[PDB]
Design a protein around this ligand. Structure first.
Ligand SMILES: OC[C@H]1O[C@H](OC[C@H]2O[C@H](O)[C@@H](O)[C@@H](O[C@H]3O[C@H](CO)[C@@H](O)[C@H](O)[C@@H]3O)[C@@H]2O)[C@@H](O)[C@@H](O)[C@@H]1O
Ligand SMILES: OC[C@H]1O[C@H](OC[C@H]2O[C@H](O)[C@@H](O)[C@@H](O[C@H]3O[C@H](CO)[C@@H](O)[C@H](O)[C@@H]3O)[C@@H]2O)[C@@H](O)[C@@H](O)[C@@H]1O
Ligand SMILES: OC[C@H]1O[C@H](OC[C@H]2O[C@H](O)[C@@H](O)[C@@H](O[C@H]3O[C@H](CO)[C@@H](O)[C@H](O)[C@@H]3O)[C@@H]2O)[C@@H](O)[C@@H](O)[C@@H]1O
Ligand SMILES: OC[C@H]1O[C@H](OC[C@H]2O[C@H](O)[C@@H](O)[C@@H](O[C@H]3O[C@H](CO)[C@@H](O)[C@H](O)[C@@H]3O)[C@@H]2O)[C@@H](O)[C@@H](O)[C@@H]1O
Ligand SMILES: OC[C@H]1O[C@H](OC[C@H]2O[C@H](O)[C@@H](O)[C@@H](O[C@H]3O[C@H](CO)[C@@H](O)[C@H](O)[C@@H]3O)[C@@H]2O)[C@@H](O)[C@@H](O)[C@@H]1O
Ligand SMILES: OC[C@H]1O[C@H](OC[C@H]2O[C@H](O)[C@@H](O)[C@@H](O[C@H]3O[C@H](CO)[C@@H](O)[C@H](O)[C@@H]3O)[C@@H]2O)[C@@H](O)[C@@H](O)[C@@H]1O
Ligand SMILES: OC[C@H]1O[C@H](OC[C@H]2O[C@H](O)[C@@H](O)[C@@H](O[C@H]3O[C@H](CO)[C@@H](O)[C@H](O)[C@@H]3O)[C@@H]2O)[C@@H](O)[C@@H](O)[C@@H]1O
Ligand SMILES: OC[C@H]1O[C@H](OC[C@H]2O[C@H](O)[C@@H](O)[C@@H](O[C@H]3O[C@H](CO)[C@@H](O)[C@H](O)[C@@H]3O)[C@@H]2O)[C@@H](O)[C@@H](O)[C@@H]1O
Ligand SMILES: OC[C@H]1O[C@H](OC[C@H]2O[C@H](O)[C@@H](O)[C@@H](O)[C@@H]2O)[C@@H](O)[C@@H](O)[C@@H]1O
Ligand SMILES: OC[C@H]1O[C@H](OC[C@H]2O[C@H](O)[C@@H](O)[C@@H](O)[C@@H]2O)[C@@H](O)[C@@H](O)[C@@H]1O
Ligand SMILES: OC[C@H]1O[C@H](OC[C@H]2O[C@H](O)[C@@H](O)[C@@H](O)[C@@H]2O)[C@@H](O)[C@@H](O)[C@@H]1O
Ligand SMILES: OC[C@H]1O[C@H](OC[C@H]2O[C@H](O)[C@@H](O)[C@@H](O)[C@@H]2O)[C@@H](O)[C@@H](O)[C@@H]1O
Lengths: 108, 108, 108, 108
């Protein structure tokens, strides 16, 4: 999938993907955007811990947590509580949008 | 694709899709969300014109336009100018989120 | 997903999808190919049973089974035992190909 | 897309993708299967030419050609003329299946 919704987490080894782009939460705690095999962007936090998870929070903050729940890296975009999405876009940009402004209200 | 970015248009017959969900801009100008063959939601504007297109504007407004560029239906969420996305989500909700709060800045 | 591999089954309500095309195993036991809301092809076996499942067998036969495991419809392409795939193609054709002729051998 | 149909070609830089798997026809003429950034399989023909293209032929043969149309590598599965598909499967195997055994005949 190419979208991480607020309230969701990407566990170790999990990722967002689109075409040849992979945004992965690595086991060495480095969050990396790859274009095939080339690292395009990273949090540069590899080695600081093991088995981190990525959380797209309801306050709009994207945070990498270690098992002890200490924040290793954050987008520092926390703020208003609502619904947000982190998207790995077709143009290779990873963007956080929010909050929701309109909906059809057809959610199950 | 399941995302319509601001600055984009879905021409007549074009759509957003995810699994069995299809959000289509029909030729009879009705914008309909289908779950397989069942209409789940619609703007109920079929017959009011022919060959309409759907525009996700930079002001956050989702508008259905007829060829003469007159708005047939709108979400009425127009406002701040920026970047927005209209997503046909995995939970079957069609939602508009915006503006962008953070990005890796890796866009080509 | 747009591929049903041999050894797999699509339970009631499950489907293959690609763009606006949905090949679904309905609860009324009718196997239907939809292009948005229009039925393009069907086995025309709706009502003959309830809760059927679709099986892409290892003998290359695509069979619709009722709960009592009696074949309601079949492609009648059963034959050589091997690996087959039933694909809902981008050109809107649903095709069974097989057997395998070559592989990288990189399966987990 | 995760399927290369017979009669199609993947030009230089083009690829098949599924999840974190990328089967790419590189500009250095090496055909490589990547699992994120790790090479899982390759034809090991990098440097033998520039700007090769991958062809899934109607005779069931998968061939890497250089601009001068000389075969750099082949699966050597050429044979019966018909319809074939090369699939980058969900189980990380890249497999060629063919020929077609059955179809709904709903192709546009
Ligand atoms: O250009 C962005 C960024 O790229 C490089 O950082 C990304 C790499 O950071 C670390 O070196 C690792 O996390 C590495 O990950 C690979 O190696 C790991 C250790 O062998 C392995 O566990 C992983 O599976 C993966 O293969 C990242 O690829 C670096 O150039 C940065 O300076 C730069 O900002
Ligand atoms: O915020 C007040 C509201 O909170 C609690 O309900 C939360 C749900 O409210 C609605 O049903 C939806 O907004 C639902 O979320 C869906 O729609 C969103 C956009 O409309 C979208 O962003 C989500 O992804 C999802 O599809 C909320 O989850 C509850 O306490 C209510 O009583 C209260 O009024
Ligand atoms: O429950 C939501 C909504 O569903 C129904 O409206 C959707 C239908 O609206 C019109 O009837 C048409 O636009 C129809 O579209 C189909 O028929 C067209 C005309 O034959 C055809 O051109 C299209 O390709 C399509 O097959 C929509 O499906 C209705 O029950 C609403 O009351 C209700 O709000
Ligand atoms: O707004 C001021 C800015 O406007 C003009 O540039 C617009 C581009 O600015 C950045 O490069 C990006 O924001 C780019 O959009 C990409 O990133 C967004 C999030 O960062 C994302 O929502 C988009 O989808 C896209 O990936 C903008 O397009 C120009 O006049 C600048 O000089 C000026 O500073
Ligand atoms: O052109 C192909 C084929 O189309 C038509 O058959 C498909 C329909 O067959 C039955 O009528 C039903 O299975 C129907 O399914 C819909 O209705 C069901 C009952 O209301 C419902 O449970 C399903 O969810 C679905 O909405 C199929 O759509 C028919 O014209 C054939 O002659 C023709 O061969
Ligand atoms: O047929 C003889 C063989 O059968 C049993 O092994 C079956 C597996 O054999 C290989 O490992 C693979 O073929 C594997 O299937 C993978 O590759 C196929 C193409 O190579 C592909 O179609 C499949 O989808 C899958 O990716 C088979 O599952 C076993 O009894 C062996 O001892 C015996 O030699
Ligand atoms: O385990 C499979 C296979 O892996 C390795 O071969 C794959 C690599 O082969 C060559 O080294 C290159 O084609 C390389 O491609 C990368 O480097 C290129 C040159 O810098 C660059 O142009 C490409 O974009 C790409 O980044 C492949 O990755 C090797 O270990 C084999 O022995 C082994 O069989
Ligand atoms: O082989 C004899 C036949 O060849 C020429 O027609 C080729 C087309 O024939 C059918 O229309 C289809 O098979 C079509 O291919 C579609 O269906 C295939 C399975 O049925 C599938 O594999 C393909 O991907 C495609 O969807 C062929 O392309 C022509 O000379 C005919 O006159 C002649 O009888
Ligand atoms: O080290 C990374 C950042 O860690 C902290 O920010 C994370 C926290 O921010 C907000 O308090 C909430 O969103 C919390 O849920 C979240 O954990 C700060 O120290 C920040 O400055 C760091 O950049
Ligand atoms: O008939 C549908 C709506 O049409 C108009 O709104 C559309 C316009 O809204 C803003 O002015 C901008 O976003 C424009 O680009 C857009 O066309 C209004 O009449 C509204 O009340 C209607 O609901
Ligand atoms: O009624 C549909 C078809 O049912 C039977 O064929 C299904 C069986 O075919 C082969 O025997 C095997 O592949 C079995 O696994 C499969 O169930 C036949 O009666 C056929 O004539 C019908 O068309
Ligand atoms: O060097 C790779 C292979 O090249 C040749 O095979 C490719 C040719 O095979 C069949 O003749 C047809 O499918 C042709 O279209 C195709 O180009 C052979 O030399 C083979 O032995 C090599 O392995």
């Amino acid at each position: 999938d190419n979208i991480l919704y607020s309230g969701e987490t990407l566990s170790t080894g999990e990722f967002l993907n689109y075409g040849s782009f992979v945004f992965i939460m690595q086991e060495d705690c480095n969050l990396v955007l790859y274009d095939v095999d080339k690292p395009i962007w990273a949090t540069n936090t590899g080695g600081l811990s093991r088995s981190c998870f990525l959380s797209m929070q309801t306050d709009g903050n994207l945070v990498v947590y270690n098992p002890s729940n200490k924040p290793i890296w954050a987008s520092n975009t926390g703020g208003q509580n609502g619904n947000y999405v982190c998207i790995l876009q077709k143009d290779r940009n990873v963007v956080i949008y929010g909050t929701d402004r309109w909906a059809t209200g057809t959610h199950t």
